[PDB]
mmCIF file of C-alpha atoms and ligand atoms in Angstrom:
data_model
loop_
_atom_site.group_PDB
_atom_site.id
_atom_site.type_symbol
_atom_site.label_atom_id
_atom_site.label_comp_id
_atom_site.label_asym_id
_atom_site.label_seq_id
_atom_site.Cartn_x
_atom_site.Cartn_y
_atom_site.Cartn_z
ATOM 1 C CA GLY E 1 70.599 79.248 134.518
ATOM 2 C CA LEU E 2 69.914 80.279 130.909
ATOM 3 C CA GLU E 3 68.955 83.825 131.954
ATOM 4 C CA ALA E 4 72.685 84.319 132.492
ATOM 5 C CA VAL E 5 73.298 83.331 128.858
ATOM 6 C CA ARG E 6 70.707 85.822 127.545
ATOM 7 C CA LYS E 7 72.308 88.616 129.571
ATOM 8 C CA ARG E 8 75.965 87.801 128.847
ATOM 9 C CA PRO E 9 75.858 86.013 125.472
ATOM 10 C CA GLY E 10 79.433 87.197 124.715
ATOM 11 C CA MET E 11 80.727 84.864 127.430
ATOM 12 C CA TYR E 12 79.047 81.844 125.811
ATOM 13 C CA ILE E 13 79.290 82.401 122.045
ATOM 14 C CA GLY E 14 82.232 84.854 121.846
ATOM 15 C CA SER E 15 80.393 87.452 119.805
ATOM 16 C CA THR E 16 76.857 88.680 119.150
ATOM 17 C CA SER E 17 77.806 89.800 115.613
ATOM 18 C CA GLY E 18 77.517 87.661 112.448
ATOM 19 C CA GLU E 19 80.238 85.386 113.859
ATOM 20 C CA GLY E 20 78.070 84.502 116.871
ATOM 21 C CA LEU E 21 75.017 84.036 114.644
ATOM 22 C CA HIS E 22 76.907 81.385 112.667
ATOM 23 C CA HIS E 23 78.340 79.822 115.814
ATOM 24 C CA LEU E 24 74.789 78.821 116.785
ATOM 25 C CA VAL E 25 74.657 76.561 113.731
ATOM 26 C CA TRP E 26 77.913 74.783 114.701
ATOM 27 C CA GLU E 27 76.751 74.193 118.242
ATOM 28 C CA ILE E 28 73.729 72.259 116.946
ATOM 29 C CA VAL E 29 75.603 70.533 114.087
ATOM 30 C CA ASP E 30 78.332 69.385 116.518
ATOM 31 C CA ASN E 31 75.760 67.280 118.367
ATOM 32 C CA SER E 32 74.731 65.543 115.127
ATOM 33 C CA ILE E 33 78.413 65.016 114.330
ATOM 34 C CA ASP E 34 78.851 63.348 117.757
ATOM 35 C CA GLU E 35 76.047 60.949 116.828
ATOM 36 C CA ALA E 36 77.775 60.171 113.502
ATOM 37 C CA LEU E 37 80.973 59.570 115.499
ATOM 38 C CA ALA E 38 79.101 57.152 117.803
ATOM 39 C CA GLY E 39 78.343 55.262 114.563
ATOM 40 C CA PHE E 40 74.611 55.803 114.196
ATOM 41 C CA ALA E 41 74.071 58.953 112.118
ATOM 42 C CA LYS E 42 74.865 58.624 108.386
ATOM 43 C CA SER E 43 73.592 61.942 107.052
ATOM 44 C CA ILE E 44 73.068 65.512 108.268
ATOM 45 C CA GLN E 45 71.068 68.254 106.542
ATOM 46 C CA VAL E 46 71.509 71.938 107.404
ATOM 47 C CA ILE E 47 68.817 74.240 105.996
ATOM 48 C CA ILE E 48 68.610 78.041 105.992
ATOM 49 C CA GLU E 49 64.842 78.531 106.010
ATOM 50 C CA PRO E 50 63.202 81.412 104.088
ATOM 51 C CA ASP E 51 63.020 83.491 107.304
ATOM 52 C CA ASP E 52 66.752 83.067 108.204
ATOM 53 C CA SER E 53 65.840 80.371 110.755
ATOM 54 C CA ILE E 54 67.907 77.142 110.824
ATOM 55 C CA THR E 55 66.892 73.464 110.607
ATOM 56 C CA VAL E 56 69.382 70.658 111.349
ATOM 57 C CA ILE E 57 68.240 67.100 110.548
ATOM 58 C CA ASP E 58 70.156 63.938 111.424
ATOM 59 C CA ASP E 59 69.322 60.231 111.116
ATOM 60 C CA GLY E 60 70.915 59.043 114.364
ATOM 61 C CA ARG E 61 69.262 57.236 117.251
ATOM 62 C CA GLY E 62 67.381 60.311 118.452
ATOM 63 C CA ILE E 63 68.163 62.219 121.674
ATOM 64 C CA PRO E 64 67.153 60.105 124.707
ATOM 65 C CA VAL E 65 63.573 60.889 125.771
ATOM 66 C CA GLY E 66 63.271 58.904 128.984
ATOM 67 C CA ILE E 67 62.851 60.471 132.428
ATOM 68 C CA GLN E 68 66.139 60.914 134.303
ATOM 69 C CA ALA E 69 66.093 60.087 138.030
ATOM 70 C CA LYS E 70 68.336 63.066 138.880
ATOM 71 C CA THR E 71 65.981 65.604 137.242
ATOM 72 C CA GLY E 72 62.533 64.004 137.008
ATOM 73 C CA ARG E 73 62.453 65.394 133.438
ATOM 74 C CA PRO E 74 63.002 63.762 129.996
ATOM 75 C CA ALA E 75 66.694 63.774 128.961
ATOM 76 C CA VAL E 76 65.891 65.762 125.793
ATOM 77 C CA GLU E 77 64.315 68.585 127.839
ATOM 78 C CA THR E 78 67.445 68.813 130.017
ATOM 79 C CA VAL E 79 69.632 68.978 126.867
ATOM 80 C CA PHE E 80 67.941 72.229 125.846
ATOM 81 C CA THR E 81 67.132 73.794 129.229
ATOM 82 C CA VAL E 82 70.167 73.224 131.476
ATOM 83 C CA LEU E 83 73.572 74.868 130.973
ATOM 84 C CA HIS E 84 76.251 72.260 130.196
ATOM 85 C CA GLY E 102 78.703 69.007 121.998
ATOM 86 C CA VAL E 103 77.308 70.724 125.137
ATOM 87 C CA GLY E 104 75.965 73.936 123.588
ATOM 88 C CA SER E 105 72.334 73.054 122.764
ATOM 89 C CA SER E 106 70.923 75.003 125.726
ATOM 90 C CA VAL E 107 72.957 78.093 124.773
ATOM 91 C CA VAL E 108 71.451 78.018 121.271
ATOM 92 C CA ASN E 109 68.028 77.637 122.889
ATOM 93 C CA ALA E 110 68.568 80.600 125.226
ATOM 94 C CA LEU E 111 69.632 82.880 122.342
ATOM 95 C CA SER E 112 66.730 81.926 120.060
ATOM 96 C CA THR E 113 63.227 83.458 119.947
ATOM 97 C CA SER E 114 62.059 79.883 119.495
ATOM 98 C CA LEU E 115 63.526 76.421 119.201
ATOM 99 C CA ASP E 116 61.679 73.196 118.437
ATOM 100 C CA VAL E 117 62.997 69.651 118.671
ATOM 101 C CA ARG E 118 61.522 66.504 117.152
ATOM 102 C CA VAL E 119 62.970 63.133 118.160
ATOM 103 C CA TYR E 120 62.136 60.151 115.916
ATOM 104 C CA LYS E 121 62.579 57.027 118.031
ATOM 105 C CA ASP E 122 60.858 53.665 118.625
ATOM 106 C CA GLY E 123 58.081 54.365 116.128
ATOM 107 C CA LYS E 124 57.184 57.732 117.693
ATOM 108 C CA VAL E 125 57.859 61.473 117.157
ATOM 109 C CA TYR E 126 58.510 63.265 120.463
ATOM 110 C CA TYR E 127 58.139 67.038 120.271
ATOM 111 C CA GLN E 128 59.011 69.957 122.535
ATOM 112 C CA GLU E 129 59.327 73.700 121.910
ATOM 113 C CA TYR E 130 60.905 76.581 123.859
ATOM 114 C CA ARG E 131 60.555 80.371 123.672
ATOM 115 C CA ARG E 132 63.616 82.460 124.567
ATOM 116 C CA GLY E 133 64.851 79.373 126.440
ATOM 117 C CA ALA E 134 61.614 78.703 128.369
ATOM 118 C CA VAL E 135 59.651 75.457 127.958
ATOM 119 C CA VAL E 136 56.243 75.745 126.215
ATOM 120 C CA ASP E 137 54.860 72.335 127.175
ATOM 121 C CA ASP E 138 55.963 68.899 128.377
ATOM 122 C CA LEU E 139 57.486 66.569 125.788
ATOM 123 C CA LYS E 140 54.625 65.039 123.775
ATOM 124 C CA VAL E 141 54.255 62.258 121.215
ATOM 125 C CA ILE E 142 52.745 64.020 118.182
ATOM 126 C CA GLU E 143 53.006 61.463 115.354
ATOM 127 C CA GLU E 144 54.037 57.944 114.490
ATOM 128 C CA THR E 145 57.139 57.401 112.376
ATOM 129 C CA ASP E 146 59.269 54.722 110.728
ATOM 130 C CA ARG E 147 62.457 56.802 110.801
ATOM 131 C CA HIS E 148 64.995 57.635 113.519
ATOM 132 C CA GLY E 149 66.983 60.752 114.274
ATOM 133 C CA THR E 150 66.785 64.267 115.643
ATOM 134 C CA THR E 151 65.533 67.472 114.016
ATOM 135 C CA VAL E 152 66.282 70.823 115.654
ATOM 136 C CA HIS E 153 64.903 74.106 114.325
ATOM 137 C CA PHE E 154 65.694 77.502 115.785
ATOM 138 C CA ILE E 155 65.081 81.186 115.147
ATOM 139 C CA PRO E 156 68.018 83.318 116.388
ATOM 140 C CA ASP E 157 66.844 86.188 118.615
ATOM 141 C CA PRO E 158 67.246 89.688 117.093
ATOM 142 C CA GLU E 159 67.236 91.023 120.690
ATOM 143 C CA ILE E 160 70.622 89.260 120.976
ATOM 144 C CA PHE E 161 71.866 89.446 117.381
ATOM 145 C CA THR E 162 71.337 93.186 116.987
ATOM 146 C CA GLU E 163 73.851 93.679 114.128
ATOM 147 C CA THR E 164 72.504 90.985 111.794
ATOM 148 C CA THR E 165 70.241 87.911 111.756
ATOM 149 C CA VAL E 166 71.032 87.180 108.093
ATOM 150 C CA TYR E 167 72.935 83.940 107.303
ATOM 151 C CA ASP E 168 75.851 83.603 104.875
ATOM 152 C CA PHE E 169 75.347 80.523 102.713
ATOM 153 C CA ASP E 170 78.954 80.405 101.402
ATOM 154 C CA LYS E 171 80.301 80.727 104.982
ATOM 155 C CA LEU E 172 78.125 77.792 106.089
ATOM 156 C CA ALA E 173 78.935 75.728 102.964
ATOM 157 C CA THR E 174 82.678 76.233 103.455
ATOM 158 C CA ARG E 175 82.558 74.810 106.975
ATOM 159 C CA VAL E 176 80.093 72.034 106.038
ATOM 160 C CA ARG E 177 82.583 70.853 103.377
ATOM 161 C CA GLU E 178 85.394 70.984 105.988
ATOM 162 C CA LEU E 179 83.230 68.926 108.364
ATOM 163 C CA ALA E 180 82.541 66.324 105.651
ATOM 164 C CA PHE E 181 86.295 66.003 105.090
ATOM 165 C CA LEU E 182 87.145 65.705 108.809
ATOM 166 C CA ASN E 183 84.340 63.180 109.206
ATOM 167 C CA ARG E 184 85.131 61.116 106.086
ATOM 168 C CA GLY E 185 82.137 58.889 105.235
ATOM 169 C CA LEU E 186 79.509 61.313 106.538
ATOM 170 C CA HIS E 187 76.935 62.743 104.153
ATOM 171 C CA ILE E 188 76.306 66.378 104.976
ATOM 172 C CA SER E 189 74.425 69.015 103.000
ATOM 173 C CA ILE E 190 73.694 72.740 103.190
ATOM 174 C CA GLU E 191 70.559 74.244 101.619
ATOM 175 C CA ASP E 192 69.411 77.836 101.187
ATOM 176 C CA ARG E 193 65.630 78.276 100.880
ATOM 177 C CA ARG E 194 65.671 82.081 100.829
ATOM 178 C CA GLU E 195 63.876 84.018 98.079
ATOM 179 C CA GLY E 196 65.759 84.465 94.785
ATOM 180 C CA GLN E 197 68.824 82.505 95.900
ATOM 181 C CA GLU E 198 67.759 78.903 96.487
ATOM 182 C CA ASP E 199 70.806 76.620 96.393
ATOM 183 C CA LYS E 200 71.990 73.277 97.781
ATOM 184 C CA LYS E 201 75.406 71.670 98.079
ATOM 185 C CA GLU E 202 75.954 68.072 99.201
ATOM 186 C CA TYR E 203 79.284 66.735 100.452
ATOM 187 C CA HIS E 204 80.587 63.214 100.966
ATOM 188 C CA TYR E 205 84.116 61.937 101.139
ATOM 189 C CA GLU E 206 84.382 58.188 100.549
ATOM 190 C CA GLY E 207 85.825 55.637 103.012
ATOM 191 C CA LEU E 208 87.439 52.289 102.129
ATOM 192 C CA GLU E 209 84.842 51.678 99.363
ATOM 193 C CA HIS E 210 86.699 54.295 97.252
HETATM 194 N N1 MJU J 1 74.038 63.804 125.130
HETATM 195 C C1 MJU J 1 72.947 64.568 124.554
HETATM 196 C C2 MJU J 1 73.474 65.805 123.831
HETATM 197 C C3 MJU J 1 72.710 65.924 122.515
HETATM 198 N N2 MJU J 1 72.184 64.576 122.345
HETATM 199 C C4 MJU J 1 71.843 64.048 121.083
HETATM 200 N N3 MJU J 1 71.795 62.691 120.957
HETATM 201 C C5 MJU J 1 71.507 62.057 119.783
HETATM 202 S S1 MJU J 1 71.413 60.370 119.706
HETATM 203 C C6 MJU J 1 71.876 59.604 121.142
HETATM 204 C C7 MJU J 1 72.998 60.063 121.840
HETATM 205 N N4 MJU J 1 73.420 59.482 122.975
HETATM 206 C C8 MJU J 1 72.763 58.412 123.481
HETATM 207 N N5 MJU J 1 73.171 57.809 124.622
HETATM 208 C C9 MJU J 1 72.498 56.749 125.100
HETATM 209 C C10 MJU J 1 71.375 56.244 124.437
HETATM 210 N N6 MJU J 1 70.930 56.806 123.297
HETATM 211 C C11 MJU J 1 71.566 57.881 122.773
HETATM 212 C C12 MJU J 1 71.147 58.501 121.598
HETATM 213 N N7 MJU J 1 71.282 62.725 118.632
HETATM 214 C C13 MJU J 1 71.295 64.080 118.582
HETATM 215 N N8 MJU J 1 71.096 64.993 117.581
HETATM 216 C C14 MJU J 1 71.201 66.289 117.991
HETATM 217 C C15 MJU J 1 71.085 67.530 117.351
HETATM 218 C C16 MJU J 1 71.262 68.703 118.101
HETATM 219 C C17 MJU J 1 71.566 68.657 119.468
HETATM 220 C C18 MJU J 1 71.699 67.436 120.159
HETATM 221 C C19 MJU J 1 71.522 66.253 119.437
HETATM 222 C C20 MJU J 1 71.591 64.826 119.821
HETATM 223 C C21 MJU J 1 72.161 63.732 123.541
#
């Protein structure tokens, strides 16, 4: 399965240069956009963490966590571990680590993966009053051998484009890296304008 992705990443993300590095972000963001399209997510936050890792936070319903009959595994695990708005498992495969938190039905469901492999079964780790999905990943320098450094302006440009194409969505981009902290928030108004 995902071993194939780690060995031929060019066939899945087009490039292992800076372009591929940024493509990982869009693969995750696209899933949050799908949940805004379904009518449930209102806001998406994209964060470049101080270590060039990425966090994407949405306030949708939360990825389904129940056991699927076909797999015997929680739906959320399958999302990240089986090759398939279908790119989550590719991002997982090409990351040193990825962690997902699903906020749903008063609970926070957590799972983590290392170079695509599951660490432990999905576990409830906290109670919560919110809903949505948070995905955090560290792109693998074994794959991204040219650069693992993110371009804030490049991300911001596309985030703004996404806000426009998805009029009504709130979407932000934040840089938390040393000496260059910045945040831009975008929102195009609907009929209330
Ligand atoms: N179909 C899968 C693909 C991803 N997924 C998600 N589903 C939902 S919410 C959802 C979607 N579909 C449903 N279908 C039936 C019942 N509940 C649902 C909740 N939110 C997500 N945020 C992400 C951020 C990154 C990657 C994936 C998601 C995501 C469900």
